């Protein structure tokens, strides 16, 4: 059981509609805690989780360090868009997107499990730092321009330094400073609703509301037989208050409801639940 500090960068051009835009968000597990948007008047790194409102007293240079980092990053991806556009011999007319995802996965006692730094151009893989954190994989011929640049500059070592160092150290600071929010293991609120459609066919919908973290498993069973192939599993959604929701639906023979059970697996649950429906 690990925790994660992950960052997400999106920089897209407005080919005739202002300079490019740069947006960066940071996550600890499934909770967002920081943001940066280059469109603001004088853009700054800003808190998005409660415990981040105390980082100014705990680290008096955190906001200016990261604001300077993000504003700098916005500049280099602005140029990066033009470089990559020339790599593919693309015109100035279209809009294009650079995406970046990096962070660390850390096991219980503060031990690093894996770092990563992956980038995409127009929604497809471009270059990624390998698992040994010492080499890059370019996805196409155009990305070999970037890989040759980054190899000769030794950028993999600087990435490994961060991923093995500050990434683990700040995931630990965040975990402890935000233990209330992050180490939370809230089970879902579960219940089964009902929507007949015929005098002859009926929908059973098994809900799970307000759970954190996002990982959850909903399974429908008929007399102990898994009905995964026959159910309608909706994509998990953010509840708007730092938690999540998800339901699984089945269509059953009317009158034969009590042979169907909903199996719910969540981390903040004592044991997996088996749910029947009852009038």
């Amino acid at each position: 059981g690990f925790h994660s500090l992950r960052y997400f960068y999106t920089a897209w051009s407005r080919p005739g509609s202002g300079e490019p835009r740069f947006v960066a968000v940071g996550y600890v597990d499934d909770t967002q805690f920081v943001r940066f948007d280059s469109d603001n008047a004088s853009p700054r790194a800003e808190p998005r989780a409660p415990w981040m409102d105390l980082v100014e007293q705990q680290d008096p240079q955190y906001w200016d360090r990261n604001t300077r980092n993000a504003r700098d990053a916005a500049q280099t991806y602005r140029v990066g868009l033009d470089n990559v556009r020339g790599y593919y011999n693309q015109s100035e007319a279209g809009s294009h997107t650079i995406q970046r995802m990096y962070g660390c996965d850390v096991g219980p006692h503060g031990r690093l499990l894996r770092g990563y730094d992956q980038l995409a151009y127009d929604g497809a893989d471009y270059i990624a730092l390998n698992e040994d954190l010492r080499s890059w994989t370019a996805a196409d011929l155009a990305a070999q321009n970037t890989r040759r640049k980054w190899e000769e500059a030794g950028y993999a070592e600087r990435d490994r330094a961060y991923l093995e160092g500050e990434c683990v150290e700040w995931l630990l600071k965040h975990l402890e400073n935000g233990r209330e929010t992050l180490l939370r293991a809230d089970p879902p609120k579960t219940h089964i609703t009902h929507h007949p459609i015929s005098d002859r066919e009926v929908t059973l919908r098994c809900w799970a509301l307000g759970f954190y973290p996002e990982e959850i498993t909903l399974t429908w069973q008929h007399d102990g037989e898994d009905q995964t192939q026959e159910m309608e599993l909706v994509e998990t959604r953010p509840d708007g208050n730092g938690a999540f929701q998800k339901w699984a639906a089945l269509v059953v023979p009317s009158g034969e409801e009590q042979r169907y059970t909903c199996h719910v697996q969540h981390e903040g649950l004592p044991q997996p639940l088996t749910l029947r429906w009852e009038p």
Partner: protein, 98 residues
Amino acid sequence: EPRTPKIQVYSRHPAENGKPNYLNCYVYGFHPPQIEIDLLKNGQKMKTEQSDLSFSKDWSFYLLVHTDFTPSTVDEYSCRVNHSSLAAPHMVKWDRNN
């Protein structure tokens, strides 16, 4: 080539009239990042708050749009999404049973 968004429209809590709640419009699985998301109140644009841009491991984006809403029986709730992958803006209605 553009990826088309998937849209769920919902309340945070099991809804009943009078009691105020939170109406959300979750838009995910799309690309390029530019979009227009508004929650409409009887076909009219509400004032809303939009989440910060993030993306999934398949590089598709997701956004949450929300506003304080008070359920009634006389008024309608819709979310109007527009994206380059759509021929025209798509409007989804908030159904008491999402």
